[PDB]
Structure 1
Amino acid sequence: DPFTGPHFVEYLSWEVTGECNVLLKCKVANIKKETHIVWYKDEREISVDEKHDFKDGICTLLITEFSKKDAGIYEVILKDDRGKDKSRLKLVDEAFKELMMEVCKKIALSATDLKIQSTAEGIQLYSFVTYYVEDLKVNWSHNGSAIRYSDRVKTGVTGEQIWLQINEPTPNDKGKYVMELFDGKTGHQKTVDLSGQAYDEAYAEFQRLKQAAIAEKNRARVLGGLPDVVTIQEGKALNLTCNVWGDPPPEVSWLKNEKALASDDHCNLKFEAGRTAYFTINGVSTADSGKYGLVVKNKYGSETSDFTVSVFIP
């Protein structure tokens, strides 16, 4: 401590870390309480937090989600009534390029071996990265050739997932699959073989999923509009309405007290477009009380809707 004014001991630098963040660093010395430590991106100040505290000895600032944005010129400016010292560190063309391709190695190294997983769309080829795409151009090889990209087989990425998909796989689609993660200078590969065993077993649950999923879409279904209990004064009239759906249009059927129920002039059921069932009583008498159910069903499934008309005599 003098005075002559604070000063750096180590100048600005960068390293990569853990979840592939760029951490900047520098050591500083000769630091009064009342000293100022302030960072700047492109002369525009980074207004994170307090510039009225410090001790020793290292000074960091962490860049997150790092990418082309966090490029440009960074500087840490130490000051206080005694003096000022700048340490400037510059991240642009051919400085930055060195950095990007430097993150990716670390990204690329965290790339869980290629694994096989099927979905209702096809079979799918994914590897995990810890963690994340950027300027890490990406490529795939089926048996030593590029892959012609289509609507049946696509590539893509998702958060920390790198995937190849394969809608409507078939035997022609078995073979050797490889990943080319390209940082800028180097390349990196990871592989897997979609064949026999594994495959027969993926195309297995694939089929499963699709059949079940086609099914869980057009199964008949009561959408809503009945209550669970209605309670009505004897003699009054009653209108319930209930929307259904299915594809094919469904067959509705009514049930009072667990046996079938006939439409009729006094207890009239309608059905329409295969969209709307219409329960209706032109004067609820005690004998019209009990427990009703509506039951839609088509080829992919059934489903019922259960209500209770209880009645009181005024």
Structure 2
Amino acid sequence: QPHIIQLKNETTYENGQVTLVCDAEGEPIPEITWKRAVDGFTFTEKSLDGRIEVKGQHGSSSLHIKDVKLSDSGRYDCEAASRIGGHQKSMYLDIEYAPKFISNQTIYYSWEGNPINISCDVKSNPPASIHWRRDKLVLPAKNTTNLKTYSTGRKMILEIAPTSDNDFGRYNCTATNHIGTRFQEYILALADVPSSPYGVKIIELSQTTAKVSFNKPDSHGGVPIHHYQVDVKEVASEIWKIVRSHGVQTMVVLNNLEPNTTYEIRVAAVNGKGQGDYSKIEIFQTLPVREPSPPSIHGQPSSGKSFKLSITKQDDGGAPILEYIVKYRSQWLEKKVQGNKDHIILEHLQWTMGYEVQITAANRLGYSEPTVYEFSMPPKPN
């Protein structure tokens, strides 16, 4: 009746090799099978890659792996089976290795007076002891009052309060366990302000507004652009006014400009360190105040032999409409009404007749092009 007497936990190192051994008693002499817990593969007296092979020694088995991978770790099951019965137990293969660094970022940017934390992240088995250093000097040392290190469990942090072109440069994070010492080099670099935005264009223009469009700088200086600043100045003025973009949009709308006015502008990106270089100056001129746009009208019958035109407010042109001029025929007749007006009543018409009408709007600048409108009077009532 098979009974396993020895099946010990094993430890080995990555890329090394290991031997798992199951010892079992019993009459008749027990047969022995290995199963790998993870994928449930079974082994007895292969395999493909040829890394793993099993050899038996009458009442005892051994499973040998060469070139151990981290995926070899975990539980392995030994079953000793015969005609009369079976016994099964389990063991664990632990795999050790020199520390590995899994930090996704090794270059960091800051500037004088701006505190920054650099993080070192390490997987290792057994757990490593970890230190930050510069040329074999562990940090902070007593003579580096601007440095501090923290451990959070899964990270080792070096906090730098930069205050000298000496706080910038390379730092080593070094980790060691009994397999060995490994290290990862980090860089703290001096951030800069952004370079010039370019390809600046006025891509929309009106009387009192304009939208400026541009390309982002080829250099953000090492820390992300936060927003953009557009300076805008009347050529005839000495005072620049400031417009901050909405976030990182490469387009800014200028509001409240004066009509028919020549403006100069320039754009600069701002990052955490400060304001970047200005683009080349760009010039544009806002549209002029003009005459009103052509009026828009429609009508309905108004008793008795009259008709009422209603005004659907239209583009002012920058100066108040103070006068509508309705001329109608079907030779012509004129008629004027005031800007604040809502409608116009034409009177003394004939039944069943059709009329030709032209409407003009006027402001301090002049008259619009006339709007043509025609209508048919209804038949006579009884």
Same fold flag (TM > 0.5)? no
Higher strand share: 2
Higher helix share: 1
The one of the two structures with greater contact order (alpha-carbon pairs below 8 A, sep at least 6) is 1
TM-score (ref. length: structure 1): 0.37
